[PDB]
Design a protein around this nucleic acid. Structure first.
Ligand SMILES: [K+]
Ligand SMILES: [K+]
Ligand SMILES: [K+]
Ligand SMILES: [K+]
Ligand SMILES: [K+]
Ligand SMILES: [K+]
Ligand SMILES: [K+]
Ligand SMILES: [Mg+2]
Ligand SMILES: [Mg+2]
Ligand SMILES: [Mg+2]
Ligand SMILES: [Mg+2]
Ligand SMILES: [Mg+2]
Ligand SMILES: [Mg+2]
Ligand SMILES: [Mg+2]
Ligand SMILES: [Mg+2]
Ligand SMILES: [Mg+2]
Ligand SMILES: [Mg+2]
Ligand SMILES: [Mg+2]
Ligand SMILES: [Mg+2]
Ligand SMILES: [Mg+2]
Ligand SMILES: [Mg+2]
Ligand SMILES: [Mg+2]
Ligand SMILES: [Mg+2]
Ligand SMILES: [Mg+2]
Ligand SMILES: [Mg+2]
Ligand SMILES: [Mg+2]
Ligand SMILES: [Mg+2]
Ligand SMILES: [Mg+2]
Ligand SMILES: [Mg+2]
Ligand SMILES: [Mg+2]
Ligand SMILES: [Mg+2]
Ligand SMILES: [Mg+2]
Ligand SMILES: [Mg+2]
Ligand SMILES: [Mg+2]
Ligand SMILES: [Mg+2]
Ligand SMILES: [Mg+2]
Ligand SMILES: [Mg+2]
Ligand SMILES: [Mg+2]
Ligand SMILES: [Mg+2]
Ligand SMILES: [Mg+2]
Ligand SMILES: [Mg+2]
Ligand SMILES: [Mg+2]
Ligand SMILES: [Mg+2]
Ligand SMILES: [Mg+2]
Lengths: 110, 91, 124, 48
RNA sequence: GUAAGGCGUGGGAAUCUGCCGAACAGUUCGGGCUAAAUCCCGAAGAAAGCUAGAAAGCGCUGUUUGAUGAGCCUGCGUAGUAUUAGGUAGUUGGUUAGGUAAAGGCUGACCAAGCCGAUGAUGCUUAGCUGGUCUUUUCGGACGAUCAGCCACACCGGGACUGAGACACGGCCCGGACUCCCACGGGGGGCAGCAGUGGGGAAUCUUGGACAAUGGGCGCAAGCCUGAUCCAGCAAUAUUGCGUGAGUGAAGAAGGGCAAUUCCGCUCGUAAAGCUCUUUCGUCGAGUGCGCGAUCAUGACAUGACUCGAGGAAGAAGCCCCGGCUAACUCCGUGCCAGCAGCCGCGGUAAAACGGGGGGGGCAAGUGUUCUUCGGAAUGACUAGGCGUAAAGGGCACGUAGGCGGUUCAUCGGGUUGAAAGUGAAAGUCGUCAAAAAGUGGCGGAAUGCUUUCGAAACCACUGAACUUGAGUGAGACAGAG
RNA sequence: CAUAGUCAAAAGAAGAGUUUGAUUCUGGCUCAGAAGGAACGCUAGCUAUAUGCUUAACACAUGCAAGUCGAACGUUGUUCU
């Protein structure tokens, strides 16, 4: 089965991901059919995360029956190319979060 | 592309061997070197003489070394027959 | 040559003999001393240079020089052998390394003393 | 397919224009070759 | 192991393809394994049922398809050696049967004598190939270790079975060597998986933690597996990193070295000590944690990081060298000895060259030495060299292959050339920005190539008609120890 | 209008010592540069990221590296109501 999955790039303790179209039997960072985009799991200066996708190629691979992995299902819902995964209906776990403000430039308590 | 060569052997049954020339570019010394391949081709009627210029088509494997089929004889080789030549002299 | 000649018959390389064939492209080789002796230099030099006949671990027999002043080598002492000839002595193409295995360092040496296995003198 | 048929139409015009130019050049060639042949025939007769 | 059944690159036809996507049709009846079945057999047409706990949800079968893989073939490119010249006999081809999912001498039989080779077959030696790594004004040379793609192998040989897929590293059968048990009849094993141990060697690590992330198997899920991986441990092995303080300080202290023993006699030296300031890195003590990697939830790392506090310049500088090449000089000792040495060379009583003191120079958590590669080396010269006297014109020809070689006009479109399309994996090199502070990524460029289509027609090749300047003939004159 | 527009894809070319009484030439040897899966000496504070049996495809102690599904199927036997 063709799979839309995540290949690990970056370095140790600095993860970066590429979105790949692969045969399922292939090694994780080895052989692939196509690079489809990227995803940055670390939050940047803008307060959010980054992602790029080749929308037409992802539509091609989904049209011929490729199966997205568990993080790629979330990433493709978030970009609007797939419906929401079934577990996002459960809502978030609550609890008292520490909302004491920290300075953006210095990281100390305001 | 189109594969054209000269018949160098025809003594097999339904088979010829065809010599095809090509130019190899020696990149270090900037010259063009003639190289020859000998290809075995199917010739059902056994019509090709040695020295004929033929065109070959690709084919599925027909035998162990036969992968081509003779399609067209472009130029026929000249064969010296002494008695036909003597009859031409008598005319 | 012409370009056609170079196509037919290219260019070969220069032929140069190996300097230390017995080291077998290793940086060092362990050995055991067979005979410890002296040898006189080629003229115009004159001395008594302390050498050692060493059988290497790859069963090669070499002559190695013992550098510095004074040594403790005997027959059947383990020596680590590095490359580098001694120009006074033909046929001696190697050196013994001071301060490793049986060949001791030279205490009292003060300058250039890591080439002679000598430690740094502790200040008191 | 639209680009292919437009390209074929342009090539069909270019081919006919070149054919007409080739025909008029070949018609111009024959008078020169006949005169040149007459000149060479005269020279061979003189040498004979 | 393999020198072409491999690999790189581009194509092809005579094939198969579990799981995955999308249509259609079915899913009936008997028997067998102590008991049953989605196990096995039989009949039709192929099958197989489970679930009202998963009842219109899964699953299976047949037929059409997409997608992904696999098998097969092929053009071109891809070592050394001629002090290896012939090699082949299912060999090369044909016919007919068999075998295969599938072309095929794949092989049985019959027939022919072919096929390969001086454009280097065969023999011998070495070698996995590629992307790439190091070096280098482009080219080349060496390498092919990490990582990724392809191939080969799994103690050594030989086999097949099951399966969509294997002739299968941790499957089976057989033979062999080695080895461990044995109650002595006989059994068992295969770290070139991750750790680890002997051994060899100059030399190369922990018998670690977690499946939190990513990827994979099974399962409807819940989950369960995963030495893939992720992350810790050891090692200056590498890396344009950071730190070892910042100022001030003249009793120019003591002490060391040198000195007509010159100017505080010169110098170590503002150097130290002392005094003031700041505490990066490391140390110590605490505190929050949906800070972040991960989210619906789940954190091994984490005894970390972050933030705050304590403290005190405190815990942190060597190695090589100083005759020339090559930046940096004096004293003492030694006396062709002891020794030094990359090269040239030093040492035989005033040694800047050996060894120690003192001073100084270069690099700096390194710095030397050995090995190895490229450069300098235009020192195998394509870029870019030569052969009168220095290495080097064959004693001289004739001729095979090969290489090279006049003119015009016409045709053509193989090379050449222009554009378009496909391909040229990722990583790496180059450009640029952002990120980061010894760490990353995106977009480009490059990948000089190959295939297809359509233009051009000068050149090369090919075809046709011609030309006479190069070559060769004839006629007429000659010369000659040919 | 504009999350537009800008057309970048390199840099990299060094010489010295040594044959002679001296010279120029030919021609080797050696040196200054960069580098490695390196090894050894002396000497070492820190963080991070890489890399770490090149030799014996030598022999291997020990633990782990491939299982999962009761939603395919019976079977026996445990508890309790
Ligand atoms: K020495
Ligand atoms: K490949
Ligand atoms: K084998
Ligand atoms: K996991
Ligand atoms: K070192
Ligand atoms: K200090
Ligand atoms: K000739
Ligand atoms: Mg074949
Ligand atoms: Mg050969
Ligand atoms: Mg090998
Ligand atoms: Mg190679
Ligand atoms: Mg073994
Ligand atoms: Mg199976
Ligand atoms: Mg089968
Ligand atoms: Mg095993
Ligand atoms: Mg191991
Ligand atoms: Mg050992
Ligand atoms: Mg998973
Ligand atoms: Mg599933
Ligand atoms: Mg592990
Ligand atoms: Mg550094
Ligand atoms: Mg700190
Ligand atoms: Mg702490
Ligand atoms: Mg968190
Ligand atoms: Mg740590
Ligand atoms: Mg100087
Ligand atoms: Mg003296
Ligand atoms: Mg010196
Ligand atoms: Mg000295
Ligand atoms: Mg060169
Ligand atoms: Mg050069
Ligand atoms: Mg030249
Ligand atoms: Mg020369
Ligand atoms: Mg000449
Ligand atoms: Mg001559
Ligand atoms: Mg001669
Ligand atoms: Mg013309
Ligand atoms: Mg053309
Ligand atoms: Mg690329
Ligand atoms: Mg990058
Ligand atoms: Mg970049
Ligand atoms: Mg001389
Ligand atoms: Mg290895
Ligand atoms: Mg089972």
């Amino acid at each position: 089965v063709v799979r839309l999955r995540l290949s690990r790039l970056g370095c140790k303790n600095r993860p970066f991901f590429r979105v790949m179209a692969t045969d399922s039997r292939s090694p994780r960072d080895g052989k692939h059919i196509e690079v489809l985009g990227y995803f940055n799991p670390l939050p940047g200066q803008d307060g959010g995360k980054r992602m790029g996708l080749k929308f037409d190629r992802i539509k091609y691979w989904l049209s011929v029956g490729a199966q997205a992995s568990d993080p790629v299902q979330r990433l493709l819902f978030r970009s609007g190319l797939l419906p929401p995964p079934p577990m996002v209906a459960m809502g978030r776990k609550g609890g008292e979060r520490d909302t004491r403000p920290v300075d953006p430039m210095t990281g100390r308590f305001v | 592309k189109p594969v054209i060569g000269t018949v160098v052997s025809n003594k097999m049954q339904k088979s010829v061997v065809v010599a095809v020339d090509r130019l190899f570019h020696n990149k270090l010394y900037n010259r063009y070197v003639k190289r020859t391949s000998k290809f075995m081709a199917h010739d059902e009627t056994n019509a090709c003489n040695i020295g004929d210029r033929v065109k070959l088509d690709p084919s599925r494997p027909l035998s162990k070394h036969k992968n081509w089929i003779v399609a067209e004889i472009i130029k026929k080789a000249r064969i010296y027959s002494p008695q036909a030549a003597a009859a031409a002299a008598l005319s | 040559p012409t370009f056609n000649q170079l196509i037919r018959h290219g260019r070969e390389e220069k032929r140069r003999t190996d300097r230390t064939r017995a080291l077998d492209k290793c940086p060092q080789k362990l050995g055991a001393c067979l005979r410890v002796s002296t040898r006189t230099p080629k003229k115009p030099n004159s001395a008594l240079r302390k050498i050692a006949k060493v059988r290497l671990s790859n069963r090669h027999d070499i002559f190695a020089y013992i550098p510095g002043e004074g040594h403790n080598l005997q027959e059947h002492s383990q020596v680590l052998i590095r490359g580098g000839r001694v120009k006074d002595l033909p046929g001696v193409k190697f050196h013994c390394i001071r301060g490793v295995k049986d060949l001791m360092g030279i205490p009292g040496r003060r300058r250039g003393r890591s080439k002679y296995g000598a430690e740094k003198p502790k200040s008191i | 397919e639209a680009r292919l048929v437009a390209e074929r139409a342009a090539n069909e015009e270019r081919r006919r224009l070149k054919a007409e130019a080739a025909k008029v050049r070949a018609e111009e060639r024959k008078i020169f070759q006949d005169e040149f042949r007459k000149t060479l025939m005269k020279e061979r007769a003189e040498k004979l």
